[PDB]
Every structure is written in C-alpha cells, then in structure tokens.
Design a protein around this nucleic acid. Structure first.
Length: 341
DNA sequence: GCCTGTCTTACACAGTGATACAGCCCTTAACAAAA
C-alpha cells in the first residue's frame, strides 16, 4: 500500500466531505460537488482523472432524457450489473434530505467523451424516509436481483421537529428495505437481531448476502464492534430475509472500502472514537458462507495524516482510495492523497 | 460567441481632538396685564 500526494486544478473547491466516486470501465467520475452546479458544469458530475499525481476535474454532460439530480452529500450508493450506479438519499445543498433514487449509466461514449444518463426511479410501497449515511447494495438470489437498504439518519418527524432543534438528527429505525428497481417498489422487514439504529457503517455484498460492519449509533453514542450478516432468499414472489450476528466485528464509523480482488476487500480509514482515528487497516476475505477479518500492515502515514482530526475519502475502484485532510496556517483548504493496494 | 475567482486601487465615510460660530439668559427703566 503506497501513499502518494495529489495536486488539484483550479476547481479544487468542488471536493467536499460526503462526495462520491463512481467507476465506469476504468474511468472515474466525481459527484456531489459543494454548492449548486454552476454554468461551468451544469450537471455536477465530473471526469475525475489523476495523471502523474495531478487531479483534473473535467465537466461531464447528461443525455437529453436525463434528470439533473441535485448534488448529494453522504448518499447511499451501489453498483448494478449494462453497468449502472444507484444513488439513494443524501443531503442537498439546501440541507434537505431526498427520498429519491437516481440511476447513473453511460448513455454515449464517443471518442472517449462520456455522456451520462441520470434517471429518477419512483418508489412505492414501504418507501424509506429521507436519509443520509445509510447503505444500499444489490443481492442476487435464485436468478433474481434485489436492492438491500439499511441504516442512516434523518431529521425529526414533522410532528416532533421544532425550530430550536431544527437540524437535530436521529438514527433511522433498523428496518431492512428490499427494493425492486424493476417494479419501483419497496418492502420493509423488521428483524429482531437489528435492535439499534446504525449509520456511517460499511456494507459488503456477495451473492445473496450483505454484511454490515462498524458504524455509529447516535442514541448510545457507540461505534459497536459487531458484524451482521443479512441473507436474502427470493423464492418466486415471496422474499425472505434472515440476519445472523457473527463475532469478530471491527468497531469503525465512516471507514472506506475498496475491492482488491474478487472475494477480498480492504477496509482503511475511519474513526474508532470521536477524538481518535482508526489508523490500522483490515483485510476481509470472503467465503460462500464465511467471512474473515484480518489485521493488515498499517500504511506509512505522514505526520499530517497522523495528527489530523478528520479525514474523508472515497473508493476509486481500482483498489485505490482517494483521501483528504484539512490544513490551516498560511495554507490550502484540503490536502489529498491516493492510497494504492 | 466564456466563466469566474483574484487582484487592485478608486472612493466615501467614519470618527478623531481641535476649533469656529451661534444661541443662550440676561442687564439698565417703565408700563402694565393677569390675577
């Protein structure tokens, strides 16, 4: 794992905590810019290309049949296999939470210049309340595909919300949501094993299962060291969901996850306590019914990283993470690194 | 047939202690109006 500093072009201000990166056919893209999109890039979607440790953000265009989704911070994202990206929830530049779900796909790649399709999917049934900091992944069971959504935070319900605490947030009830994108429907499942709310956790999806790692629970103000396996079977039109607690769970919120090889993932970064950062790294190796979490060699962090109180980042896709920390003195607002695996 | 920060001074005015100017109630006698 080699750490490398990155320089940024004129529009560095766009990058903020809560941003996301999506990878299409090796090409990386950036979404969730700070502020509302400007004339320079009306979509809020950017080619995110790092050449010789220099990062350029170049505006990307939408197809004629696209939505223009608002920039979203801490939305739930996953990748769907004809490869597309699912974005659900998040905070908008006006601090509202969206209940909408957007789908990003490549509409046209002409002479290495990508046009995107952003389509909004209506959701009916048990729609999950607007959220941020929650997970969504795709499971495959019995030749059928289903979305699994869990966790996050939201504002108080319209009945109890008051202007003195107008921005107060609470964890959502820990109901797993099965989401059929084909029909646009959502079903909620209460499980006894998920008693507490959880947000900013990590989710790993393999076949018919999603594992839930770390995260932070507001009510207890704990980052629990639990690992949850959630299995989904889809026999015809009657889905079934079952959860199992598995000991050996890491305790981490806001960690970043990257795939280094099939059935092996690396977990880097995050927070172990409010004032402490998780400097260690984990390797997760997947079996068809087993999951293994092993400590790995901690990278050669610089002193700036070691002493930073906050860091934020995203997975670039090619086993490489894009990281960031703030700096004061004279000078830059943010300093960015790329950690390879 | 551009966008959009950064940079640079123009510009007005704030607000200092000093200073110039106007307005203050009188000061001589006498009538006298209200009470």
């Amino acid at each position: 794992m080699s750490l490398q500093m990155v320089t940024v072009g004129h529009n560095i201000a766009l990058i903020q905590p809560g941003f996301s990166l999506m990878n299409f056919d090796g090409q990386v893209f950036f979404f969730g810019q700070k502020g509302w999109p400007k004339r320079s890039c009306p979509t809020g979607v950017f080619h995110f290309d790092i050449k010789q440790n220099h990062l350029k953000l170049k505006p990307a265009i939408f197809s004629k049949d696209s939505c223009y989704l608002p920039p979203l911070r801490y939305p739930a994202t996953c990748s769907y296999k004809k490869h597309q990206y699912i974005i659900h929830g998040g905070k908008t530049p006006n601090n509202e939470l969206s209940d909408k779900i957007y789908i990003m796909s490549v509409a046209c790649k002409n002479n290495k210049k990508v046009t995107f399709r952003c389509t909004e999917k209506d959701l009916v049934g048990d729609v999950p309340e607007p959220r941020y900091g929650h997970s969504i992944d795709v499971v495959y069971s019995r030749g059928k595909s289903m979305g699994v959504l869990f966790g996050g935070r939201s504002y108080m319900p319209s009945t109890q919300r008051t202007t003195e605490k107008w921005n107060s947030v609470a964890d959502c009830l820990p109901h797993v949501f099965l989401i059929d994108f084909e029909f646009g429907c959502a079903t909620s499942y209460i499980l006894p094993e998920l008693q507490d709310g959880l947000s900013f956790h990590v989710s790993i999806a393999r076949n018919d299962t999603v594992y839930i790692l770390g995260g932070h629970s507001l009510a207890s103000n704990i980052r629990p060291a639990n690992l949850y396996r959630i299995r989904v079977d889809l026999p015809l039109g009657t889905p079934a969901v079952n959860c199992t607690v598995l000991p050996g769970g890491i305790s981490v919120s806001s960690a970043i996850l990257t795939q280094t090889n099939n059935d092996e993932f690396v977990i880097v970064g995050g927070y172990q306590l409010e004032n402490q950062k998780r400097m260690v790294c984990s390797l997760v190796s997947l079996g068809d019914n087993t999951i293994e979490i092993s400590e790995m060699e901690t990278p050669d962090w610089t002193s700036d990283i070691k002493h930073s109180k906050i860091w934020f980042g995203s997975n670039m896709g090619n086993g490489t993470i894009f990281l960031g920390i703030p700096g004061d003195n004279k000078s830059e607002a943010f300093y960015f690194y790329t950690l390879r695996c």
